Amino acid sequence: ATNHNLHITEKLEVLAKAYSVQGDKWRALGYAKAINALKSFHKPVTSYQEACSIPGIGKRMAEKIIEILESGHLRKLDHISESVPVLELFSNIWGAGTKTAQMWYQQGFRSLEDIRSQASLTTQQAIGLKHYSDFLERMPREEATEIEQTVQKAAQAFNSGLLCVACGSYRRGKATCGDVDVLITHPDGRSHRGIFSRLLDSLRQEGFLTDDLVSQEENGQQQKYLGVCRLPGPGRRHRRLDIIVVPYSEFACALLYFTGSAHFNRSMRALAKTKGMSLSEHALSTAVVRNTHGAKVGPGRVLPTPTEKDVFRLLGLPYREPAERDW
C-alpha cells in the first residue's frame, strides 16, 4: 500500500538517520519501528490519542506527531548536530563506521577530499573511498545475474558438482541489487572444503576481482569473501561481491541467513530466542541456556534442518517465500 502520514514520517526519518549515524542504535531502532507503523496504517494520524494507540508509538513519539500537525514543523529537527551530514558522508565509506566517522570529524575533517589527503585509512577504507560513488549505487537485476553466473562458471570449472546460489536481495526477487551474494556448497558434504583458494585465484586470473575487502586465505577454514568485481566491456561499474562457502549439512540455515532480509533474520532469530532456541547461519539449536541479559550461556542441541521449511516448522512458523522476507 502507501503511507498516509508522509508529512510525519518525513520529519521522523531525519531524526532516525541522525541518531543512527551517531551510534544511538536502539533510539534509532525506536524511530524505525514508529515510522514503519505510521505507514502500514490506514489513515492520517490527526489525534495525540490516535498516536498512542498505535503499537510502536508511545507518549514521546505521539507528542512529536502533534507538533508536525499543529505546527506543521518539528522544532527538534533544527537542534540536530551540524556534524550529522558529515558523519553520514564518512560512514558511507565501506569499512568506516560511526566510531571512525566521529574520530575523523573530531580531527577536523569535513569532506572526502580531507579524508583522501589527510586521514589515516585502513586498507578496506581506502578501497571503499576509491569506489565511493559506485558502492552507493544498486545494479540492475540482470547484472547481478551475470556476476552470479561468472562465479558459478568459475567454480563448476574445477568441480561440476558445486552448487552456487545467488542469495540476498537477488533471491528475494528485487529489481536492483546493492551487491551480489553467492552461496557455494556441495551435496557430497565435503568437496566444498578448501575451494576458496582455487575459486579466488581463478576469478583473479580473468581480472574479474579487482579488490579484496575481507578474505582470510591463510586459514583453510575460510568462511566468507567480501570483495569487489567488474564485468568486462564499456559502461561497467565496480560492484561489491559477497561469497560464502558452506558444508552441505548447513545448507538450509546458510541459505536462510544469506537470503535475509537482515531485518527478517533478526526477527526470526529473536523468535527462536523466546523459544529457548538459537538460530545462526550454521544451524538452529534448541535447549539453549541464556542469562538475564539475554546472552547465550549454554550451547544446546543442533536440530535437523534439511531444508528452509524445516527451520520455519521447528519454530512453529508458516513458511515464507524469499519474496515474503523482504523486510
Add this chain to the structure above:
DNA sequence: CGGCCAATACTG
C-alpha cells in the same frame, strides 16, 4: 531498570 530487530566472521 533494561531488553529490543541476532548471531556470527575478519582485521589488526
Add this chain to the structure above:
DNA sequence: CAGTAT
C-alpha cells in the same frame, strides 16, 4: 579486544 561487516 573494538570496530565493522554479513
Add this chain to the structure above:
DNA sequence: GCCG
C-alpha cells in the same frame, strides 16, 4: 525511541 517503546514497553513491561
